[PDB]
Chain length 213, copies 3
């Protein structure tokens, strides 16, 4: 993409696991991030599913510079602009639309949109994208689906998400067409509530180490 300094590819190749984060209380944003980074996980997807979403992104950006902070659940050109202004380094969407693809390519940060079918993948490719989110992974047909897609689209790379856990993330990471996976298991809800950042670091650490094959 002509206007992307940080390629989508670089974002997805930074690490094997990208935590899909849902921060309910702003205060938990930074400690959670530092907790994750401490465990070896740097690419953080802060989903726009809470009121403090945009503020948690800005906070993590200022206080945790090493973290590669981005926004998740970006659904339209305005949310994209909003997170871009708030310092998001990348944007991830559950699916794609033309208005979103357009505003993205014209923007400055990389967009890694989710797709479920090859028709959706083709729409994305028509806009020149090469990296995609495969969501929801299991529902879409999981590993087998990705293996089928690699036939007509050998150059395309994915980040499967949805139904991925330490019990199966290795099945996906093994595919050549898979660069990394998304998961929400790294940050247990109860964990933030209890201020158990220690646990979060162990999960992150275990995620990366278990990703070595």
């Amino acid at each position: 993409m002509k206007n992307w300094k940080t390629s989508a590819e670089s974002i997805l190749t930074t690490g094997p696991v990208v935590p899909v984060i849902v921060v309910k209380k702003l205060e938990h944003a930074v400690p959670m991030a530092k907790a994750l980074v401490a465990g070896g996980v740097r690419v953080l997807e802060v989903t726009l599913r809470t009121e403090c979403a945009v503020d948690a992104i800005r906070a993590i950006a200022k206080e945790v510079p090493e973290a590669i902070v981005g926004a998740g659940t970006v659904l339209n050109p305005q949310q994209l602009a909003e997170v871009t202004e708030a310092g998001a380094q990348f944007a991830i969407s559950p699916g794609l639309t033309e208005p979103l693809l357009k505003a993205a390519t014209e923007g400055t940060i990389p967009l890694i949109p989710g797709i479920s079918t090859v028709s959706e993948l083709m729409l994305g490719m028509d806009y020149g994208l090469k990296e995609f989110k495969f969501f929801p992974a299991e529902a879409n047909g999981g590993v087998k689906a990705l293996q089928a897609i690699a036939g007509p689209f050998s150059q395309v790379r994915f980040c499967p998400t949805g139904g991925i856990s330490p019990a199966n993330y290795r099945d996906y990471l093994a595919l050549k067409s898979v660069l990394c996976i998304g998961g929400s298991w790294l940050v247990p809800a109860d964990a933030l509530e209890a201020g158990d950042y220690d646990r979060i670091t162990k999960l992150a650490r275990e995620a990366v180490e278990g990703a070595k094959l």
Copy 2:
């Protein structure tokens, strides 16, 4: 929606079950509709899958005022115009296209379009819709798929249809994102052939009661 008198939500929240009707003989339309209303089910989806489908919608619209009649299997603006002229109160489609979304938006009746993927859902949302049909429910991945597909979209409401039986509709109705389900067991062909309307009313009553709690 700006142009819709009746909200798509009102249609979906009128009752727990919306019958997906296939009536081949026009002479069975009205009594079948009254039988349904007698069982407590007043939102009737007559599918455009038979020759008399539209005439059936018109008859029910005129003769059964205690029922909210609409069209099913509406595939394009042409059919949307036809069912609207016929008196349909709402329109349901197996999936969606922009031409259909545009005609419905500018139209006067609510359209509850089906979707299988988040990109299809997002396209619908780009047109202002917030209520969708999840079809074919079972093939899309069932409750788990809907729980994932609905996850990043907290405000969206669905009406799952396809493979839904009395044996599993409670599993869907139990979902926070589900307002009602669509089922074709309330109007069995065999029962419609022998004019067994008492059986149809019972099926409606059981559907309504079996959905409680």
Copy 3:
């Protein structure tokens, strides 16, 4: 389709099996085509997944006129125009986009695009298409998924592809909505490299024999 001299339907009703061909060495193209024809299979889908793909179509068109050669993995207008110019008698794509559909309808040869959802099916139907590819068939939910997707659309026919084999192709061919299936087992990569055309003719004859329903 007004602009297609040869209908999409005729392409799919030619035989029960359409080989999805991946040829890496141009010199193998002609003998391969002759071997398949000799086995009773003549609708050859040369996929655009190799550098010599287009020349292969040109050569087959030239040296094996009795075969109905076409292109697969056609992703956009440019490729559609390129294979059309090279002599392709039909085009197949993994999925569909509006630009590809518009260009195909304006063009001179039939496009049989893949779809996975009813919304994608409806988009294709908006452009007047009635024949589609169902890909990736198995990963999409197989026979059950196709039967559900086909439920509300009685006029459309399919060519399931993706994970189809002698073990299950009859399960698909048995469906009223299925005209034929696409498979790559008739031309194993090792057979091509070894120039083992007797084997290819055998697989073809066996494919045809085992499909009789």
